[PDB]
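Notebook B, p. 112. Complex prediction, attempt 2.
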Amino acid sequence: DVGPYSNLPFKVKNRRVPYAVPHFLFFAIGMGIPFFACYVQLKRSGSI
Amino acid sequence: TATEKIIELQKFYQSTNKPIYAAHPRSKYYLIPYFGLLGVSVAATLFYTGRACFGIKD
Amino acid sequence: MNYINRWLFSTNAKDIAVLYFIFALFCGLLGSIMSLILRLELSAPGNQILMGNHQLFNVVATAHAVLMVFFLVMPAAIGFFGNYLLPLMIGASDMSFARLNNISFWLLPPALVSLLASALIENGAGTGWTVYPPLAGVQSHSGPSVDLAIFALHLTSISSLLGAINFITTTLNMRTIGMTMSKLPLFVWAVVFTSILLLLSLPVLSAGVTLLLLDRNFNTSFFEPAGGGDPILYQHLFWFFGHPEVYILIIPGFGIISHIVSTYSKKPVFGAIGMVYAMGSIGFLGLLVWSHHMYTVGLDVDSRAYFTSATMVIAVPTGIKIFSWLATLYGGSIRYTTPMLYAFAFLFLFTVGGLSGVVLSNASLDIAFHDTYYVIGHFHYVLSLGAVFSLFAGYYYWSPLITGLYYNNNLANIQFWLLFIGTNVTFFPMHFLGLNGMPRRIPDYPDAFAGWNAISSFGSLISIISVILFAYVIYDQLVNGLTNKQLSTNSLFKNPDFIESNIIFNDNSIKSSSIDFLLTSPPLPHTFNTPAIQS
Amino acid sequence: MRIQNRENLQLFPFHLVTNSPWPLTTSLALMSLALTLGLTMHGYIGNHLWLFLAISLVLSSIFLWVRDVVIEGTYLGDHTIAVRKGLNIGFMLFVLSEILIFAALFWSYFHSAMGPTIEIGCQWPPVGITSIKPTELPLLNTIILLASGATVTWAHHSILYKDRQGTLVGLFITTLLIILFVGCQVLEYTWATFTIADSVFGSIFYAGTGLHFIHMVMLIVMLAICYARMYFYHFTSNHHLGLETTILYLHVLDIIWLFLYIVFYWWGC
Amino acid sequence: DVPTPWGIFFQDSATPNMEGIIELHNNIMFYLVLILTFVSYILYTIIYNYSNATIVHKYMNHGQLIEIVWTTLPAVILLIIAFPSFILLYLCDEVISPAMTIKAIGLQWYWKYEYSDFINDDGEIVEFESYVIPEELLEDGQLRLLDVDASVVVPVDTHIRFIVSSADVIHDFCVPALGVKVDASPGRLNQTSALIQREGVYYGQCSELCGVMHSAMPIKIEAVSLYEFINWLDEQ
Amino acid sequence: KEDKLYIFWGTVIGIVISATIFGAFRYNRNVPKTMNREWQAASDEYLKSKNAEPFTGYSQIQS
Amino acid sequence: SRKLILFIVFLALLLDNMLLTVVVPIVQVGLLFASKATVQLITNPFIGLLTNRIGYPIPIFAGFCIMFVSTIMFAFSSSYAFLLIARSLQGIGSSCSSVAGMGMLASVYTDDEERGNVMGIALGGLAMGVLVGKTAPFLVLAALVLLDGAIQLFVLQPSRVQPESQKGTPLTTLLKDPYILIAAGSICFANMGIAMLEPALPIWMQLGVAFLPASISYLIGTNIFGILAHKMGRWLCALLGMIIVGVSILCIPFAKNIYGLIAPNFGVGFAIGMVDSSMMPIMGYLVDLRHVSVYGSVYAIADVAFCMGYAIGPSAGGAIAKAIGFPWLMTIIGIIDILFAPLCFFLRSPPAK
Amino acid sequence: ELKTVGFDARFPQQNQTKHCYQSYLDYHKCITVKGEDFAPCKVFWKTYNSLCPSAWVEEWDEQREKGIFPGNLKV
Amino acid sequence: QFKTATSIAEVEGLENLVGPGAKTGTVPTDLEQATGLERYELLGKLEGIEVFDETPLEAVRKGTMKDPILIDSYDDYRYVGCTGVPADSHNIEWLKPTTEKNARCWECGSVYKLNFL
Ligand code: HEA
Ligand code: HEA
Ligand code: CUA
Ligand SMILES: [Cu+2]
Ligand SMILES: [Zn+2]
């Protein structure tokens, strides 16, 4: 089964949910966590 | 038989069809408490690091 | 069960490099959004986004330092390019201690959790990246934040030590039949010379951090001056780690550039023995200087004169490497593909960022530049434009071989030009702000420093767009990547010569100087059954 | 390579490890140890029986590694001449790293011994702290260490002349000659006049001679697994790498103790 | 002095030490500009001439004379740089007779100035504390985050020795025009020396990080004549 | 020839977007009271009476 | 101030052993290898009288310039006579530099406790030259340090000839004293064995890893036992040092492999370090107790006793190795080094005058 | 006419933390003997009042009055 | 698990390399306790046969297409690195001979053929 889509941990083709959703959610979480941290520490210290 | 079971266990660890860490009929006694208590040790430090972010102390 | 025994319980060295890449991408996204938070606050005078909180500004700066000194550049330059390429270049099947490679990967996700949990249970850890003793005590930071942040610098230290011992032990006795240790490629020498500094530097950091912990929580008073200690000792015990560290980030970059300069300009490298001796000299003279970070603490007058002399000497070996790269690029034929664009943008910007280091080396001139934005502008031209550019060049060089899927050339060029323009807009007026007198680590500034802060907030929004375009380049590589090899001739590793016909070239396509580009391109799981032969 | 049936055996002398689960479990134990020690020291947990589970699970994880290291060498039989050289180079590069932790602690001693501050009236061992006399129990420990360095040479030179009773007795005598060191040094920590918090002097004296304590519990364990693996016939007269690593580890600790006795216990003025 | 809005270069000097710093920087920039122009011209020649070329000189890979020329020529530059650096390091300091001493102790988020001389028989030492003026209480024309309520007033043409320490954490005394940047660590005294040649106002800011109120801790130095200093010292 | 135009007009529409994003964070600013022309003209008189920047220039006016 | 003198002396001893030992990477061979040591042995007593006349700083930089011009004449020399002349001038420069530098460290650091620490740091340059790529970084680092030294000594403050205020004792008066000679004999007989071991080691038996542990141990030994020799008494350190040198020398004939020499070599180098840093300060102590304080000729005698081993070593060692052999030579030098060690107890309290 | 401490070449460095302590100890040594009103023991008084911060002197005086003081004041 | 070998002429796998046993009260010898790829080296070195070769490439004669250099392998491919006929003239160029095609070394010109054993 050695081939061009065999060394990757995630499945890319012949998949039920298309690959755009797992590709987008990875970057969405990666650029959304450090705004959540700032929101929590702002709300714990009085300011809006 | 004698203390030279070395020439007997070397015909067992070869041709086993199981992994090395679970091949002998003694590895149950080592592997059941370890994996049992590890799932409590990890599940206790994910409850006290989420309770503590909300300000709750003991 | 086959998923678990092959991507969680692993032995293969090349299958941990892909996990290192996936981790490094995430930990380089988080810090870049944290940097965008900082640069959107330092835009105009006043209190704009963080309402009045000067905490959650220092926390963001600390967590942006740690996530890209320890969690992005080192996992990419050690895990993805060192674990994958070094066995294939020296000709070995796998590493010597494979389970230590697996633990050196898996110590890092527990190090991310403690750092992200050092910014939610309390005010936070706003001590800066250098966790100085009398601020990080129990009178300013009294909570489980600094403690959980100095436990994230232990696990990374253990991982780096265990990786370095593996790298040194592998290259000594796991070579092929006809390689002595003078026919090795230059990347293996770069990994060896960074792995020796990882042995010789990390115990001092571990000792200093542990003594800081004992001062905080077991009332020991190593660094408290009410019991007979000095804070300055910690500075020694920090910076003896600090200056080896910043060569650990840059030596694996250099060798990568050499390969690109050897490839897309069809000439061998000018003076390879001089290059390995130059890397050895740079590695040795990074341990005998550490106190140029501390000229204002009150040292002697005969000790500053030693550290000005021992700092400017390091310019002599680096010039040999730069001029040898110019001599390699001089005579040959040059085709401008997307690795050589990043290669050409590295030989100019490392020089500009490194010539500022000679101005800061003098103890007389450091009185005007210490804790000032000139230092920040100095080390961002070398960190963001010297290491990240080498990482992008290495990715665009070795990704078709590892993955087997090609990429669109035009979008990669647009990404490169956006990075170039935005990053040169961002870090250049920091020199002017430094020369006029703006200090470091301040949220709010006097109204005179406004205008340049309006311009350096504009390039960051250019660079984030380049990161998003890089994400789309990866997506276009993974989907329909088999059909992206006939669009452009960039997919060819080497071009036909003048006399070499096309019919002859299609029979004999790959000409190389390493084992790397002659493999089948997915590399096989067990890639060497019979040994390789070198004369 | 032109031996007749050569295809049926491996063509390069290196060890391909089978798939093992222990790297993940060590990391999951260190996660719990780091977070529990960060939390119990500032409230938030209260009960001190989670830290002890974390340390116990870490030590059992190393023991469960070393089992699969032993079975792959005395039963499967994959340790050629090259792999043994790799293991020796590896252990030397951990002994070297464990030396350089003591260098920073020695440099934390000479940065205060030569040049003390003004808060302490400028004097080593300062006023009100009575030091430990070096003509008492710190002589007994030194002579016990020099004897234990001599007894293991009678154990490594009796496995090469094929005398079994003469390898077991020497290892037994060495194992009882390291337990007495720990027993003496735990009695010198209960009959002292100064604690970890009583100066910069009481804080560096219990931090260079306390790491040595942890490093010498490891020799008691490593010598128990070297007596027990010799009693059950695992050691041949030319293939024993468990003894060679325990001998190199003991001698480095003896030389380190001879520098913890002239700098810490004798030199005070 | 005061910072200027679109600044490119240094602030103006009032001390010989800062003039030596400026002269040494302008001496180093000569050689750095020469090296950068040489490297840029070589890359321009490489791009303009040897791009997509038919002939590859793949046997010019050794060199023997040219590797000495890029090893000895940077060394001569380092010796020429190292001569005035050592002269400026050793020469310009308090060689002869300082004439005053001001102790500038750094507390948490303000400054404490003691003029240690002018002592009465009972210990009537003149002392004050300098704070920052808030934005709400500023008058018309004052500089935000730099203007204080009490300023250090010194004469002109007089050697002044500053002894800097701290009581809480590590601070850093800075007046950019005067060329003074020394730490303030909580268990030791540090010294600097300044000579001021012209009257005016000199502004400065703290450097080493101390906590939340790091950006509000200014330093302001006025340089009056001797008669005004005597009239000011008989009022405080 | 039809690819360099694509790269050029891809970089231009990468610079235009960031300018429109940065403009939106420029109208909605907290402007303190000191950043007005009638306040930076009162500072020049104080910097003129106490002689400051004799050699180069002093000017705090940037509207 | 005072530390730049320590830097100058450290670099002077480093260049001494670098130009002495490192000649091959950078009978006729017996005479050519020992050409430097004998001419240094002859011209050492003259500089001790010269420093009392013209002062300390000028012979140091004169020796540096003489060493530089002699090395650059040795660089392109082909004939035998000019090569012998070039190595003779190399030796006569290296004889001025070390003697005047050690005398000026003796002169500036008057306190007895600091002198041992500073000379323990300064003697560590005798092994860095044995350990020591391109080497052009290190030469320009040295050139920068000596530029700093020249700026402070000759530029900022004027320097005249300025002879010393007091007149020192002559060389024969120093040679009539028993204590200075018996202190010098310890250094001589300690260094004699390690001088003779080097040529006979290719005969008995890659090259750098045999000599590396002594260079590792020497720095640690001198930098530790420079400080701690004040409380322990210097005579006891000398006695223990000679004992350990003797035992580690007898340990070599029982070794039958190249890797078995690593452990005794440490036991050589550390031990000879504890011979040196203990005994070289105390000579400068003795003149402060019994004579008038001029430190030139005494450290000239000390350098004579240091260089006697390297002068006599290979020429006699080859003859003994051809005559009897390696293990009996090691046995006789070890018994001599052990037998000398009882009589170093006599330096506990010399009679003051 | 604005006169302060000169050079004092036994302490030539940038750390003046030993000059303060030595001046304080020397003043109290020469005031234990030779009376309290004597002329050269006001050179030391002006010496440590010109370098030392005041809080250090107050803490040292309280530590002296409680009997609890690490120093060599007993000659 | 089966009949034990005495020389390496009777070794048809890992099934012939277990060996006899030691006796009670004796430090065992390596000819009485060794199983895997360790005993195979042991039975090679007591005869003179080196199982794991460390001899480099032939650097004597060039390569013609009629008379090529024969490289021996147990696979269909083997990586061969050419560096010259006087053994250091040619730089390092790597080649992959195959059972269907011969490599030819674009700079100096030696031809390599694969011998399948
Ligand atoms: C990224 C890795 C990196 C690199 C490559 C360097 C390179 C150098 N750094 Fe380091 N440095 C840092 C890491 C790094 N540094 C960091 C992170 C900081 C910030 C500190 C922080 O706050 O924690 C810092 C800051 C810093 C300072 C300022 C410390 C302070 O704030 O006061 C100094 C000053 O001595 C210094 C020294 C040097 C020198 C001399 C070089 C030189 O190696 C540069 C060499 C480059 C060349 C010289 C180009 C060669 C070209 C030639 C053709 C040679 C021509 C010859 C001549 C110029 C004579 N660095
Ligand atoms: C690791 C090196 C590094 C990097 C990459 C960056 C990135 C950036 N840094 Fe720098 N910065 C530091 C070094 C670095 N910085 C350090 C050490 C500090 C702390 C100083 C202190 O604590 O005192 C600091 C802090 C710091 C500050 C805060 C200053 C302070 O508070 O005093 C600022 C603000 O202007 C700034 C600027 C920027 C900007 C705009 C970027 C932008 O470039 C961010 C955008 C990022 C990208 C352009 C690259 C994205 C990378 C990837 C996604 C590629 C992944 C790679 C592979 C695929 C192989 N940095
Ligand atoms: Cu206060 Cu800085
Ligand atoms: Cu640095
Ligand atoms: Zn060829």
